[PDB]
Amino acid sequence: IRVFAIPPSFASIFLTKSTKLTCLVTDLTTYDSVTISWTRQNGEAVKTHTNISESHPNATFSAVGEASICEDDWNSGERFTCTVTHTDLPSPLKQTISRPKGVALHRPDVYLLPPAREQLNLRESATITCLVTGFSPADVFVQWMQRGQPLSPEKYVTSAPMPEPQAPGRYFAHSILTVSEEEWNTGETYTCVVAHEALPNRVTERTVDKSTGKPTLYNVSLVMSDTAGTCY
Amino acid sequence: LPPAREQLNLRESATITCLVTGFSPADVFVQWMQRGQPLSPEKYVTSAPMPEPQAPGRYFAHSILTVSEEEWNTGETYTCVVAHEALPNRVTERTVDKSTGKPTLYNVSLVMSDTAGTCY
Amino acid sequence: DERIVLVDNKCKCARITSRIIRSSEDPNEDIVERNIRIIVPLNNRENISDPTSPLRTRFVYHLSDLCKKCDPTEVELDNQIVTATQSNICTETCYTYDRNKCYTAVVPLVYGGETKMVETALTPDACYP
Ligand SMILES: *[C@@H]1O[C@H](CO)[C@@H](O[C@@H]2O[C@H](CO)[C@@H](O)[C@H](O)[C@H]2NC(C)=O)[C@H](O)[C@H]1NC(C)=O
C-alpha cells in the first residue's frame, strides 16, 4: 500500500483560482475500509471529499481525495499532512508536503529548433522541440497549438525539470511534438506556450514554420521611390 | 523656389520666390519671417492676384525676397507665412534652407540581418 | 556634430542626415550630401500583431511620405498667436517593432476542459504590465 501526495500546481492556481490538495492512495484491496483526511499543524479539521475509482486490472483500487484550501495555506509554506487509515495497515501512513523558501525569481527563456534536415528525407515524420531554460522554481506548463487550435494532450510529451550543471539554481525542460511530413511541408504554423510566475504577463509564446528557422534560401525585394522629394 | 545657380556666381545678391496658386476668391496675404522676427517690408515685393489661363475661377500670385549671397551661403533659414480664408486653419507656413535642398551626393546604405526584428 | 538628423523613423528603421562639406575654397562649389540608412528584417511577417500571417518578402520605401511634417506650429503676428499647418499632404505599415511600445495577443488555453483566454507577450521583453 503506497500513498502519493501531489501538491497544488501553479497552472491550477492561475486557470482555476482554487487551491486543492490531493493524496492519491493505490494498492488497496477493499474500498469499504479507506479514509482520506487532512490535518493542519495545530490539529484543525479540514473538509475532504473522498471518491472511489473503478477496478484496476491488477486487483487494486485507487481512492481520490480532493479538498479546498486557501492559497495562503499552501503559499505560507504551512506544512500539511494527509491521513490515510486502513484495516490492513497496523499504522496509518503519513506524507509530508510543503513548499520550500529562500527561492528567488528568474525569467525563463524559450527557443524552438526546427526538424533536422536528414529526418525529412525519409519522408516519415518531423519532430519539433521547445527548449525552456533558466528558471526557478521547477513547475512549468507547456502547451502546443496549431494556428490558434489547441492540440490534443497526446501528440506532445514533456519532461520533468532537471538541474543545470553549469549554473546552479536555474533549471530547464523541453517539449517534443511530432507531425506528418506532408503537413509540415505544406507550410502550417506551430506555437509554443509556457506559463510561469516569473514572466511579466505570466505567459509567452513563440512561432515557427518552414520558412522561418534554418531555411534553404532568402528572397528579398526592395523598392526606393521618391528619392528626390521635398524634405525641408 | 530656391535661387538660380547662375545668379549666385556674381557674388551680388539672391532671390527667393514664394508662389501661391489655385485659390478663390482673389484675396491673399503673404509675409516673410526670419528667426521668428518679421523682416523689413522693403526687402520683399508682393503682387496682386491674377487670373489663371488654364482654369476658370482660379487665381495666383507671387512674392519675391532679396538677400545677400554670403547670408545664403552661411545657412540661414527663411519662412513664408500665407493666410487665406479657405485654409483649414487660416494660416500656412513653409521654410527653405541651403542644406535642405538639392543634394549632389546620395550616400545610400542598406544593411540586411535576420535577427534585427526591432528598432529602438 | 557635423550632421543634422532629419527623420528617425522606427517602424521602417529609416534615418536621414544632411551635411555640407567645404570642398575646395570657392563658396559656390560645396556639395550637399544626403545619407539614408535602412535596416530590413528578414524574419518578421506581414502583420506584426498576428503570428499566423505569412512571411514578408517585399519592402517599399517612399521618401516623400517619410520626410513629412504633420504638427501645427505657433506663429507670432505682433497682434495675436495662431496655429499653422506645416504641410498639406498630411494606415502606415510598421515593418519592425518599437522598443517604446508593447505588443500583446489573445490565445486560447485549455486545461481540464475549460478554456481561459490570456494576454500574451509577442515581443521578448519590451515593457512590463
Ligand atoms: C493585424 O493584426 C491585428 C491584431 O489581430 C488586427 O487588428 C485587430 O483586429 C481584431 C478584429 O479582427 C480586433 O479585435 C483587434 O482589436 C485589432 N487590433 C487592434 C490593435 O486594434 C489587424 O486588422 C491586422 N491587420 C491585417 C491587415 O490583417
Swiss-Prot record, chain C:
<dbReference type="GO" id="GO:0003094">
    <property type="term" value="P:glomerular filtration"/>
</dbReference>
<dbReference type="GO" id="GO:0070062">
    <property type="term" value="C:extracellular exosome"/>
</dbReference>
<dbReference type="GO" id="GO:0071752">
    <property type="term" value="C:secretory dimeric IgA immunoglobulin complex"/>
</dbReference>
<keyword id="KW-1015">Disulfide bond</keyword>
<dbReference type="GO" id="GO:0065003">
    <property type="term" value="P:protein-containing complex assembly"/>
</dbReference>
<keyword id="KW-0873">Pyrrolidone carboxylic acid</keyword>
<dbReference type="GO" id="GO:0071748">
    <property type="term" value="C:monomeric IgA immunoglobulin complex"/>
</dbReference>
<keyword id="KW-0325">Glycoprotein</keyword>
<feature type="disulfide bond">
    <location>
        <begin position="70"/>
        <end position="90"/>
    </location>
</feature>
<dbReference type="GO" id="GO:0030674">
    <property type="term" value="F:protein-macromolecule adaptor activity"/>
</dbReference>
<dbReference type="GO" id="GO:0005615">
    <property type="term" value="C:extracellular space"/>
</dbReference>
<dbReference type="GO" id="GO:0072562">
    <property type="term" value="C:blood microparticle"/>
</dbReference>
<protein>
    <recommendedName>
        <fullName>Immunoglobulin J chain</fullName>
    </recommendedName>
</protein>
<dbReference type="GO" id="GO:0003823">
    <property type="term" value="F:antigen binding"/>
</dbReference>
<feature type="disulfide bond">
    <location>
        <begin position="102"/>
        <end position="127"/>
    </location>
</feature>
<dbReference type="GO" id="GO:0071751">
    <property type="term" value="C:secretory IgA immunoglobulin complex"/>
</dbReference>
<dbReference type="GO" id="GO:0042803">
    <property type="term" value="F:protein homodimerization activity"/>
</dbReference>
<keyword id="KW-0964">Secreted</keyword>
<dbReference type="GO" id="GO:0005576">
    <property type="term" value="C:extracellular region"/>
</dbReference>
<dbReference type="GO" id="GO:0006959">
    <property type="term" value="P:humoral immune response"/>
</dbReference>
<dbReference type="GO" id="GO:0019731">
    <property type="term" value="P:antibacterial humoral response"/>
</dbReference>
<comment type="subunit">
    <text>Part of the secretory IgA (sIgA) complex that consists of two, four or five IgA monomers, and two additional non-Ig polypeptides, namely the JCHAIN and the secretory component (the proteolytic product of PIGR). Part of the secretory IgM (sIgM) complex that consists of five IgM monomers, and two additional non-Ig polypeptides, namely the JCHAIN and the secretory component (the proteolytic product of PIGR). JCHAIN-containing IgM interacts (via CH4 domain) with FCRM (via Ig-like domain).</text>
</comment>
<dbReference type="GO" id="GO:0002250">
    <property type="term" value="P:adaptive immune response"/>
</dbReference>
<feature type="glycosylation site" description="N-linked (GlcNAc...) (complex) asparagine">
    <location>
        <position position="47"/>
    </location>
</feature>
<dbReference type="GO" id="GO:0034987">
    <property type="term" value="F:immunoglobulin receptor binding"/>
</dbReference>
<dbReference type="GO" id="GO:0045087">
    <property type="term" value="P:innate immune response"/>
</dbReference>
<dbReference type="GO" id="GO:0006955">
    <property type="term" value="P:immune response"/>
</dbReference>
<comment type="function">
    <text>Serves to link two monomer units of either IgM or IgA. In the case of IgM, the J chain-joined dimer is a nucleating unit for the IgM pentamer, and in the case of IgA it induces dimers and/or larger polymers. It also helps to bind these immunoglobulins to secretory component.</text>
</comment>
<keyword id="KW-0732">Signal</keyword>
<dbReference type="GO" id="GO:0060267">
    <property type="term" value="P:positive regulation of respiratory burst"/>
</dbReference>
<dbReference type="GO" id="GO:0071750">
    <property type="term" value="C:dimeric IgA immunoglobulin complex"/>
</dbReference>
<dbReference type="GO" id="GO:0071756">
    <property type="term" value="C:pentameric IgM immunoglobulin complex"/>
</dbReference>
<feature type="disulfide bond">
    <location>
        <begin position="11"/>
        <end position="94"/>
    </location>
</feature>
<dbReference type="GO" id="GO:0019862">
    <property type="term" value="F:IgA binding"/>
</dbReference>
